[PDB]
Design a protein around this ligand. Structure first.
Ligand SMILES: *[C@@H]1O[C@H](CO)[C@@H](O)[C@H](O)[C@H]1NC(C)=O
Ligand SMILES: *[C@@H]1O[C@H](CO)[C@@H](O)[C@H](O)[C@H]1NC(C)=O
Length: 388
């Protein structure tokens, strides 16, 4: 169930994408596969991504829908069917305002327990009175509804199959709230443009995160309600659900207005009331799919580098949910950030992939162990380089 904001924001900077290109399955020449280009941590959300086979645009490339992470940054997965061979090369090319020129990345084949969230975004459009407004609802970090003002018939739509259980009055009620949010983001965007002495020629973004965490007994643990302007923290409701934290001077004015009108009480009532009750219903209705876990399959690869050193890479593949911890230790003693990680990445089939590497001296590989922590496991894994 989505929130309905009340008072508006008061009135009167980019992030470079990180790009991984990687196959879903371990590549074998002649064997069909999927190539992924996962683009994360960028802002603003407008981005152009192309996949290229031998320098030519690949015609059928799937793109995920606009999404952002808890740090406000946007991410996208593009992917395509492909059959690796010895001589074909593949790349992902990304154009984004943070970069003067498009960036081409070549595929280097050789390398509480429950929650609901509504992640909402409004992007102002230089010549149009109305921004684009997208809202994405999540249940246990799995997308379950989505609204996008750019659709031909904008409505909340089910994004998890079990949401077929809601009748028409549900979609209508939720859609009407999305329309109210659209108007609110529009007003706030305009107020913010004056609050910061900006001109309308530009594009600007306002984002919201709202929802609730529950314990394993399904009792409320914490509610959340926070906003970002231009991808930067603006104001957040504190954990008491009564007081606000303002990130800067503009946001303090808003905080003062909202304390005077008691806005926190309205959001408090939503977070502790409908947010919880509707999450209960969604937990029950989506029972069959929300319990699923996939244990990581882990192994260590061995990469001799210059000098007498080696890189050990500890891989975890095939796992769900995406939360995982990979650590390297030396004789049971863990290394305080000596190691190279990679952002966890979707394989595209519902599981995820991650690795972590350390540089060690040749001959001393057996002193190092990798440990994998994941809730799908019966217990944490311990592994080490295993030669032939
Ligand atoms: C979820 O499904 C399992 C397996 O059928 C069932 O035993 C359990 O009681 C269900 N729980 C809820 C909350 O629906
Ligand atoms: C590293 O492994 C070797 C060979 O198994 C072992 O003898 C040695 O004690 C280990 N080094 C340390 C510092 O524990």
């Amino acid at each position: 169930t989505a929130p309905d904001n009340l008072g508006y924001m008061g009135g009167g900077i980019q992030k470079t994408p990180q790009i991984q290109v990687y196959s879903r399955h371990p590549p074998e020449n002649g064997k069909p596969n999927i190539l992924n280009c996962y683009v994360t941590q960028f802002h603003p959300p407008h981005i152009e991504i192309q996949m290229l086979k031998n320098g030519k645009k690949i015609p059928k490339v799937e793109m995920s829908d606009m999404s952002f992470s808890k740090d406000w940054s946007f991410y996208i997965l593009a992917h395509t069917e492909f059959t690796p061979t010895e001589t074909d090369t593949y790349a992902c090319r990304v154009k984004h305002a943070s970069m003067a020129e498009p960036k081409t990345v070549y595929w280097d084949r050789d390398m509480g327990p429950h929650s609901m969230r509504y992640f909402e975004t409004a992007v102002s459009r230089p010549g149009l009175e109305e921004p684009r407004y997208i809202s994405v609802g999540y249940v246990d970090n799995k997308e379950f509804v989505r609204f996008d003002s750019d659709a031909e018939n904008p409505r909340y739509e089910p994004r998890a199959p079990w949401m077929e259980q809601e009748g028409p009055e549900y979609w209508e009620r939720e859609t009407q709230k999305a329309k109210g949010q659209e108007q609110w983001f529009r007003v706030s965007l305009r107020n913010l443009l004056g609050a910061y002495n900006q001109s309308a020629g530009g594009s600007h973004t306002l984002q919201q995160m709202s929802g609730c965490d529950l314990g394993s007994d399904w009792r409320l643990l914490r509610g959340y309600l926070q906003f970002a302007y231009e991808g930067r923290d603006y104001i957040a409701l504190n954990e008491d659900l009564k007081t606000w934290t303002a990130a800067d001077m503009a946001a303090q004015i808003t905080r003062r207005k909202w304390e005077q009108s008691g806005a926190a009480e309205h959001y408090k009532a939503y977070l502790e009331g409908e947010c919880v009750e509707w999450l209960h219903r969604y937990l029950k209705n989506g029972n069959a799919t929300l319990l699923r876990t996939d244990s990581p399959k882990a192994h260590v690869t061995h990469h001799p580098r210059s000098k007498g050193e080696v890189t050990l890479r500890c891989w975890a593949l095939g796992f769900y949910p995406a939360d995982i911890t990979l650590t390297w230790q030396l004789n049971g003693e863990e290394l305080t950030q000596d190691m190279e990680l990679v952002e966890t990445r979707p394989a595209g089939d519902g599981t995820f992939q991650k690795w972590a590497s350390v540089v060690v001296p040749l001959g001393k590989e057996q002193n190092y162990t990798c440990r994998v922590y994941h809730e799908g496991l019966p217990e944490p894994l311990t592994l080490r380089w295993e030669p032939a």
